[PDB]
């Protein structure tokens, strides 16, 4: 029998994978291909949402940071305008007892307590001649934590925070996926800037950042989808896909519609793809990996940006004394995440969750917060009581006054949030993978292929894409398989334009 | 004034490496393309010369380990039959004090002298020692060999070897190029080996390879160059690239025909090349370049193999008791190498340097020997004379005994032998090949890009592949810029029939 | 009441340890003093037994190697004929799957099996790459034996034997006590004996040694004890010490005499010591002091001494075919340790336990075997069959054939063999010795003092000479306190004749 | 021909060496014995010196730390009044940039400025790291100070300071010697005080001392002198020894008296001894020895004692505005070292060099500063400006203000005051001791033995008394070849009276 429709390239999911696969096809214009998702908005965890009272919400605010001059030139083509970024410095720090401690915390140990600044200095002191003499390489993250920063670090700040994020201990995480993530403090340096009471907070990717003025991250996405012609693509309860049948080659929709491929893309989450291709033996294989529940909590706040706050951006919290594990001050990215200052809106409560003193609808100006709550088997969350849980514990932190009046709240529960890195995880994967691919599907993104080390926006775009021209020009998948080769580097190869465009474009201008 | 012809990609040199650039380009057939060279029989170096009594001699002995399916599709395209090839083994060892020590050297100490053995063991122990305490990295080739081997090793084998072979002394070389060409011993394996006097003869690229059965590895590629369009193909005096004008992208060659590109693929010598477009900057940076001169010489003797040269494939000669680094049964790789039995062949001397008994021509069978000997201005050599103490060399490493017949005698020298892994390299390359680029120049190959630890002729072969594929794809050039990535990794992505090919051809068949 | 004997210095016990107190005092002959002791020959642990057939035993062959220049002046005076010694050179070997190692074992690996030296390599090559980094130091002795030498060595030979000879697991040993016992293999020596097969037997304080012409080494004993005052000395029944009152510091003998004292200088076994005194303090810290019972058996075989045996005097056996840990071919030391040639003697049994074939008294020569085997609550022994379990093992080690013709057996069991270097001993030791001694008491030697370290019968002897030197010259107790300091080096500061005798002879002179 | 005296032990010299000696002698009460001296006054190098103005001065502020119970029954027995001592808590300090840092310097970093502070930490984090991987020994001096503390320390402190006070350079210097002189410190625990601003002035052998209340520490040694019989001594002009005759054992003084030994303990300076004898090779050997003469300064001030000074017992000076490389704040020892306030003296200077504003003799109270300048052929001194150029130095180094008046001045030179251990000390030594041991001499002492690790009183005093009961009971001399063994112990077995004493004393009682 026939399927209603046909193509070479079938990708599944309009997230930024599936964006990057469906750009690369649509820039060749090779093979005939076609791109389906459930929602009716692209843009999958990179998208943004909207309270009834104004404010804009990312999936636990995302910054760009890109490794891929491919990515830019998309970037640049989706928003070409000036005013369409605002660029900005970034500000981080870490709340450990009652201070703002700059990031990297592990390199700033000179704005600690004494007590706690000698407990750090013997740690690394300890680690550093271990490390002068060791052979061997870490086993687990617990264990390169160790080695590169010492117990008294280990202690006061990463294993507490790392379970407070990951939702598992550091102890069943593999340590190979920190590249680029976790600083190594150098001893020298850091006990200099113990003793010169200075700071350092230049590490990082994230260096100088840029933001969409308009519509949070997901405008972006919406803005790049906006790039592909529409009869291509397949948005919404039309486009969501039920069945996989890797056998005969076809995937079946909500609507019935049967859909014919030579080579498919699947960037949803790689066990619901089992699932949906009813294989035993892959389903099995997949509920080996672990992965991490996001609960995304908003906060819209009456009044002009704190002093207290400053240009702060995101801020880590190690500490027990509130449930999130990182915070954003979004109203900083831009001022239009949140309505004007003459907007009217009444009082929801004070910071301490009582009554207001009026219920009146009242001006601005205003500022946004932004949480994030992890969630496991090993670390669950109360959902009913987790709002007043993240807005207690933004007292407790000195972010918000009893005081202060709260606008708008917001609350959101990602089922895959976060790809856990365990130990099991590559033991899992380096059969999943292969299996799949030896079935013609390319199963990529941050729950397609499960790589945190390579599970940013730009990563997964870039996922999608070398998919792609790995399945048309042979290309190898170096963002996939090589996580510390493309981001120890500055990939300026592959470009919107190539060679094979402009030589085209001269082919048939005579 | 406009060119008598026009390209998109311009081909420079019919060697492998430009080959392999008109290969990828013909498979895509996507811009217009064309490839020229001064000779009229394609392959380069990797070509075969032929004496006049009908002796084969590559140009030191070409054997395959191919990192590249694309390489190996090449190939067995180009000799398609069974029997077009033949397989052999890897039969390697090292001329040391009247022995024959199985390849690698480092690995094999019992086969040597007790008190050798000793002094070996002992370097080994302390080098051993140090590693265990070691921090820093080896900052000259020399170094890297003392580290990783010992004393012992190091003047008995290494260092005279070494500088028998580049030319230069081992303390003027990096040591970032020998990946897989230096294998580093292990101490607790080499002892025990000591012990049992057993060997260890697996290690090395070369494990098993293949020879084409005809015509040497030269047919190789004058098969691989008949599978291009002839009428894209400039081969002999009129394809002779005299002068190279970057600035308006056109191409001079000796007849006078001019040809403009829109990107130039150049393989020939970067300082030839920096000598053609007469760009004073290039050249005085080009001449900080090194490289060594490289002696061919062929020896064709009367009679059955010997039992005492045996299923010998190479042998190196670290010694002073002879000229020559390596010598090559090239007899061995295939019965076409030499005459027929029933030919019939004067004697032109005896291995001693004699007239022979009888100036007849008597019938066979035959054997074949070919030996390499460096030359630099660190290193020069005699020609006149070379050949004789070639031969006499032959006769000290019992290789010929003096009563034996030569029947011919073959002897080239190569001005290009060795591009030289000096330590200035590097720093000479990082400004050539990134200035040559920006005027759209991808220079690439043995010569083209200096790169001895990537000067394969699999190596180059996808060296302009990964050009052209960089200039249309915008693929990055992992061959050229990570030699250690490409090396340890099996290439299989890259096909010559690739899924563009594929679908295109689906979608002429409707 | 009043003593029936008073004394300033009363010394307990007539071995080597007490003989030196006597000694020294009767060389000061400053205050009065009298040596008891239950045995009516002096020699203690160092004397000789006899069989009814001729043959004499030491108690495990004593072998005279002196650190002591005063030791030696004692037994020139003793034995000073020329012919009242026996010089020898120290053959000693290692019975290793049926092979004679040259001692000590782990300097020669090359007398092993292949196989066998390889692991052992293996194991010194793992132990001296972790040495070069090693900071601390080794708990046990299991640990500084594995650091030193390697797991090969410790499996194959180490760990065996030690707990053949020490009753206890190489795990419940301290490693402080090993200075000049134990040898400390260098890899590359080990390593260049194995490759050139020669030996290194040259290591250890027995380089070259002496032996009493007759009687044994209790003659030493005997010979020393006969230069003493007789009325000084109290040996037999009337002079065994049963009580022990130190409040008022008397000793009550076997038959009621009572001895007072000033000092006490007791060489009996310190928990025996305590349970004289009736402390249960010092009862109960004895008694967590650990000790093996030593079972000292005798063969006296007819027949010339074989080729087979040659010039051995004695041999360790680490393996389990056998129940002892020692051998020692007695006869080798002196004509006089077993009957003359024209002995007539009858044959008790064949080597394999059988009837003689004839039992008839027939000449000689013999030759003499003597065994030890160790006893502990780890390690249980059966005396009924012990002895022809130890004749067995001389089988199975190819000692004695099954024809060969056994003349005489010895056995006697030695309750305190060995003072266990446990780990909890100085635990115990530094509690009992400062208690005894703030009791006006030194318990020094083997028993006395408990430590093997310094438990020879030269160390013993100058405990007791120490021991005396400090309770009148106030003399510091080196060879008790440091073992190390002692043993290594060459103590010839204190003579039989000191500086105070020679001025008081020119004293007396006018 | 006969000597006018003749003694079995003749003692040269009345210092603390010889004085031992004689102590012993006199205790056994053996061998005859005499002991004389060309100084009428016994002490040698730690007698008192006044000055017309009645302020006491020691030889550079002695202070007593005993390792030696014997030494401590000499003192209890010639000062046995509790009032005879005052016991002082160990106050020093070294002079840093306008710093008071408490001793020892290089674990009290805190108290530095944090440019320096920096520096410091980085050096020994550097040495640290070093030395976790180091497996030889220090060669010098210099390289010790950088293993154990680093360039910073070694730099700021170490190196000028050890030049200040030895006269030489620290690379010239052995440092086999430091054993209890030098501290070295523990990284943590120096960068934990430097965190805390904490302090640690516990360590050295100093920690808790006392002083003589009356005629400084030359009253000691006047008082212990005073125990022997007058008629065994021989002190002043007659007992000058002149002429020493070894091969006939005799001793030539002053008057011409002869004094016959059998043995001999010398304690003047050892090359003077060779000069003494007359013995070529060993005046060439002793001449190889160097040394470093003392100029010791006294400074009577008046004025109560100043809040700037406090309870400071002495203070180290390592910067350049000063000649003396220590001071001492005698009148805190004793306030008898100084005039009572009652008493009335004309001030001859003010600090700063002038007249003072009144030359009427008024009251006191009064202090009094000792300051010690060493002098060598490397670093020369100008005796006519060293008086003045020490009290500028107390004006620059805040002890002095300018106004303080000047009450009395002393100043004497010691040719001998140092015995600097060299590199090519223990060459000359290990010659020139045993050699005179074989001419039966023992010389002993700080410049009779020439070893500054064991050069202190008490040292000295059990140099003697050690030699002279080798001579008479064979004992080792601990404290002359093992400094680290007699420092790092508590000398508690001889006594003043011994056994031999009681037991002879109990044998005369009956």
């Not at 640049?76 to 009652?98: F, M, N």
């Not at 920063?149 to 069943?172: C, E, Q, S």
């Not at 960037?267 to 099995?284: H, K, W």
Request: glycine share 8%.
């Amino acid at each position: 029998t026939h399927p209603d429709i046909s193509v070479d390239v079938l990708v599944i999911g309009a997230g930024p994978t599936g964006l990057g696969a469906a750009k690369r096809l649509n820039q060749i214009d090779g093979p005939s291909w076609m791109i389906v998702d459930s929602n009716e908005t692209p843009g999958g965890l990179a998208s943004t949402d909207v309270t009834p009272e104004g404010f804009l919400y990312d999936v636990g605010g995302h910054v760009i940071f890109s490794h891929y001059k491919y990515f830019d030139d998309c970037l640049d083509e989706a928003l070409p305008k000036e005013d369409d970024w605002y660029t900005h410095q970034r500000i981080s720090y870490v709340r450990c007892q009652g201070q703002w401690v700059p990031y990297p915390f592990q390199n700033n140990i000179s704005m600690l307590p004494k007590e706690e600044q000698v407990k750090c200095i013997d740690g690394m002191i300890d680690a550093a001649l271990e490390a002068r003499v060791a052979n061997t390489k870490p086993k687990t993250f617990d264990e390169w934590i160790v080695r590169m920063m010492g117990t008294g670090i280990a202690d006061l700040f990463m294993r507490p925070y790392n379970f407070k994020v990951w939702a598992v201990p550091t102890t069943k995480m593999q340590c190979a996926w920190l590249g680029e993530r976790v600083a190594a403090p150098n001893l020298k340096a850091v006990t200099t800037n113990v003793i010169l009471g200075k700071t350092a907070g230049n590490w990082g990717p994230n260096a100088t950042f840029r933001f969409p003025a308009r519509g949070g991250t997901g405008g972006i996405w919406i803005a790049v989808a906006n790039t592909l012609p529409k009869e291509k693509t397949r948005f919404g309860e039309k486009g969501k896909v039920t069945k996989v049948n890797a056998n005969n080659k076809t995937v079946t929709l909500q609507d019935g519609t049967t859909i014919g491929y030579k080579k498919l893309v699947s960037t949803m989450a790689v066990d619901f793809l089992a699932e949906a291709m009813n294989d035993q033996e892959l389903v099995g294989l997949t509920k080996q990996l672990f992965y991490s529940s996001t609960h995304v909590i908003g906060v819209g706040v009456r009044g002009s940006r704190p002093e207290r706050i400053g240009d702060k951006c995101w801020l880590y919290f190690p500490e027990d004394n509130c449930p999130f594990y990182k915070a954003t001050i979004f109203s900083n990215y831009s001022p239009y995440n949140q309505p004007e200052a003459s907007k009217k809106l009444p009082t929801m409560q004070l910071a301490d969750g009582s009554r207001p003193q009026s219920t009146e609808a009242k001006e601005g100006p205003y500022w946004s917060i932004m949480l994030e709550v992890s969630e496991s088997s090993m670390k669950p969350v109360n959902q009913e009581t987790i709002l007043a849980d993240c807005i207690q514990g933004l007292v407790n932190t000195e972010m918000l006054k009893p005081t202060d009046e709260i606008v708008s709240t917001y609350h959101r529960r990602f089922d895959h949030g976060y790809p856990t890195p365990t130990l099991e995880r590559e033991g899992a994967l380096t059969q999943i993978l292969p299996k799949l691919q030896d079935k013609d599907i390319w199963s990529r993104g941050r729950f397609g292929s499960w790589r945190y080390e390579v599970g940013n926006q730009d990563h997964s775009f870039m996922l999608g894409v070398e998919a792609v021209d790995n399945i048309v020009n042979g290309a190898v998948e170096l963002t996939l398989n090589y996580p510390d080769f493309v981001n120890g580097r500055q990939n300026t190869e592959r470009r919107l334009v190539d060679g094979a465009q402009v030589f085209a474009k001269s082919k048939a201008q005579l």
